[model samples]
Target: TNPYARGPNPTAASLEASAGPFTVRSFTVSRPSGYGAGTVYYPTNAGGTVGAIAIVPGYTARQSSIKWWGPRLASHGFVVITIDTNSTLDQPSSRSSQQMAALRQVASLNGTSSSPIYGKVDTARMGVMGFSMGGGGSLISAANNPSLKAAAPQAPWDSSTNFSSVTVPTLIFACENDSIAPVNSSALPIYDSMSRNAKQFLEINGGSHSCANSGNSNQALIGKKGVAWMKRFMDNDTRYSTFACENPNSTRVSDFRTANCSHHH
Candidate 1:
């Protein structure tokens, strides 16, 4: 009995669909904090409070690069925030701090009686995500904040590929043909370095650097993986065990690898 499980029991069809059972709503942060700006997406009637996720875009990128995650994950029962770093050129380390700051601010808003998300967030349960350098930052966040429930990042790139200390569950979305952050050098090495906690590496077939970003063609499969990873780890709901840990046998994915994640029952 997981107290954190939030939607109807998930199925392949249900999880693959663009939206989940909860109705979603959004509000731009009136006052931005450690990060530059943010737009929060949340479920209006989730029946209870839920975890919060923060997403950041890559260098020279804006929120639009990863904004699609907001409603997708929120409707599945999480508070999702898509953020723009203080500078478009911000690196992974800076993005890492800003990502946590975004989560911090969301936690603050949940306690503010006047805020739209007041009483809607489980402040202790948080997740991080991003694209490219921001994805590297997400890895850094997991490495630094072991208390984070989950971390999912796409086409991750950083100065270092060593993240052997990340105890938090992580899902690395790799773009097969990513020129900027090639799988062999960037994503795979980063995934290979992790030896602790639940982790997965999913490479999108024939995908570019922006494969998991907004407006990608494989949202159905990608979204299911993302949502399942968060639910299984963040919510501690074994209902998503197979969905989160199993390597899908689909043509959409060029390659897959996983470690530490196993069925709980």
Candidate 2:
């Protein structure tokens, strides 16, 4: 699970020089042929292992939109795996099942006897990040599944599902003005419904729902804080315990917070 045992993350220049420019590729996994479906963008990090993330994009979004985040996440020590939804309009029931299947596929790629990416990821510390419709998908995926170390849903949709069932550490990001998936409509519900196990709720003021996914500076800060969140939960960084791990009540000015907003490790 300790991938960095070899070395630190490769610098941007080094990655480009060694890996011949960074690019994300769309690959399919068939059980009969392999295991899952999705487009994967490999960072310039080469063999550098930060961990693995299965990212689900918002409704109607292609893998390309989120593929940008893959390099970003990889720069911060992660192998970003983005899944393209089956279609632009996916029902909740179908999306839920697909989300679960996608997560398992990401986990399996962490390393298996037959896979090339095997042993390249620290499976012990894995996380899920999703946007809009996919945000709700992450909840259903994480609530029912136990393998994930943490889950982050940005401006999630669907307020009726049982958020209390989500047992893993979670961070829910809300946009102040998101017409598509209003804060009150989706984000707030998840906040109130989540049970124990360290939950966080953040509102990015002056930002719209789309801002959560766009490659804007504001969103980058969100990613920065997100990287810390994953490092705390997945990498088992004791230093982040009070800020992200130890305290169930955690908050960050960069625009992220946990229930209670303060606590001792």
User: Which predicted model would earn the best lDDT?
Assistant: 1
> For all the candidates, what are their Cα RMSDs to the real structure?
0.9, 5.6
Name the TM-score of candidate 1: 0.99
Residues 45-110, model 2: lDDT tens digits: 445555677777777776665555666655555666777667757754455567666656656765
Tens-place lDDT digits, model 1, residues 97-204: 999999999999999999889999999899999999999999999989999999999999999999999999999999999999999999999999999878999999
True-vs-predicted CA distance for residue 157, candidate 1, Å? 0.8
In model 2, the Cα lDDT at residue 258 comes to 64
TM-score for each prediction? 0.99, 0.75
Q: TM-score winner among the candidates?
A: 1
Model 2, C-alpha of 156: deviation from truth (Å): 0.4
lDDT of 1 at 79: 98
Summing lDDT over every window of 10 consecutive residues in candidate 1, give the lowest-scoring window. 256-265
